[PDB]
Amino acid sequence: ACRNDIHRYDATFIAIYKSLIPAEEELEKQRQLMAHLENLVAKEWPHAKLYLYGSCANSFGFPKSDIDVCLAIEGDDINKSEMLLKLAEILESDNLQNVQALTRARVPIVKLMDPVTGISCAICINNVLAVVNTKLLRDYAQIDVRLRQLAFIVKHWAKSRRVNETYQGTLSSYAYVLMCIHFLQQRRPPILPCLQEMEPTYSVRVDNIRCTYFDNVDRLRNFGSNNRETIAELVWGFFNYWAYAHDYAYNVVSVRTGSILGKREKRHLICIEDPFETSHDLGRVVDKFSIRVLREEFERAARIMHQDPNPCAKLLEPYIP
Ligand SMILES: O=c1ccn([C@@H]2O[C@H](COP(=O)(O)OP(=O)(O)OP(=O)(O)O)[C@@H](O)[C@H]2O)c(=O)[nH]1
Numbered sequence: 001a002c003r004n005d006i007h008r009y010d011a012t013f014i015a016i017y018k019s020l021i022p023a024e025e026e027l028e029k030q031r032q033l034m035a036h037l038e039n040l041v042a043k044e045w046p047h048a049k050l051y052l053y054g055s056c057a058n059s060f061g062f063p064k065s066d067i068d069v070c071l072a073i074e075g076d077d078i079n080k081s082e083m084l085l086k087l088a089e090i091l092e093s094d095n096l097q098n099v100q101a102l103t104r105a106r107v108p109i110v111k112l113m114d115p116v117t118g119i120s121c122a123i124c125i126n127n128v129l130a131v132v133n134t135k136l137l138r139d140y141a142q143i144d145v146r147l148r149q150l151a152f153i154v155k156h157w158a159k160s161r162r163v164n165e166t167y168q169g170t171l172s173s174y175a176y177v178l179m180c181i182h183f184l185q186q187r188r189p190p191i192l193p194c195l196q197e198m199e200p201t202y203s204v205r206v207d208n209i210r211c212t213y214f215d216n217v218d219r220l221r222n223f224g225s226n227n228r229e230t231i232a233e234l235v236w237g238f239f240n241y242w243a244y245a246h247d248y249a250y251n252v253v254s255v256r257t258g259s260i261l262g263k264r265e266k267r268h269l270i271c272i273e274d275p276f277e278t279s280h281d282l283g284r285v286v287d288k289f290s291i292r293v294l295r296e297e298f299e300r301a302a303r304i305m306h307q308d309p310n311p312c313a314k315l316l317e318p319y320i321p
Helices: 006-020 024-044 080-092 128-141 145-160 173-186 231-245 290-307
Strands: 049-053 066-072 097-104 107-113 120-125 202-205 210-213 251-254 259-262 271-273
Touching: 006 145, 006 231, 024 049, 024 066, 024 080, 049 128, 066 128, 080 097, 080 107, 080 120, 128 145, 128 173, 128 210, 145 173, 145 231, 173 231, 173 251, 173 259, 173 271, 231 290
Parallel strands: 066 120, 251 271
Antiparallel strands: 049 066, 097 107, 107 120, 202 210, 251 259
């Protein structure tokens, strides 16, 4: 069963959606900065490639002036420290402000702040697998608009309800997009395909991990065109799965497969399998306490999406400790 008036809230959810997406003027400043930093890095390393990654490149990012950049370069004696310090002075002689050398769990990072656009940028060497990660989600976001629409709704819900911190036992935004992709894959008729179970047209390799899938996604623009579910059906339907339908004891959600894999075949309380790094359970951060808070927020989200006379504002009302 579902609401008889569910489509009355399609209007608001998309209005919420297109407000959460970054403005074009903001993204114009990003491409202009990136085109400048690509040409600048290429002057020192003609064989290096700059790739964006993270929220600023998978097309599932909220508005902000911080971008992440992976400097891809090939070789064997690749020392990222000596490169990033040489790169640090090329930024400083380019009149870029606040060129800082930083570390995150010992990975060398350098950060800059562009005076032209006010955008910040964090640069690291050879984080290539994270680049292919965002390429997949960007490729998936091109197939159906409802993926972007649903994922922006859920990500806003996780932040408003204070369940978007892995350091507090909840799930990252990368995990939430995987749950949305997998939810839209299991709807019948399908909204999203399983790119990795298709004829390969893209195949790379990052340290004995071969990422291979079909990435001619503009050939798929009409894939989910036989599924008439609106976003108020999906948003309601998403939280309904994770509150009542997900078999938390035996099930794995698998974008890599587009189906439900068995969990018993091997701390995992909610299993979200990474599409390429398949041993990386994105729910390993959850513990026996935070799983209860997650499922309580799932059950809260479902009843609101099923009963509340104004669910679009009730679903996202902030959580106050
Ligand atoms: O376990 C992970 C998590 C994340 N990532 C990589 O980091 C990216 C997302 O990482 P985040 O979960 O930190 O997204 P975000 O906080 O920056 O987004 P906002 O809610 O702030 O808007 C993803 O694009 C992924 O490639 C991994 O590689 N492994």
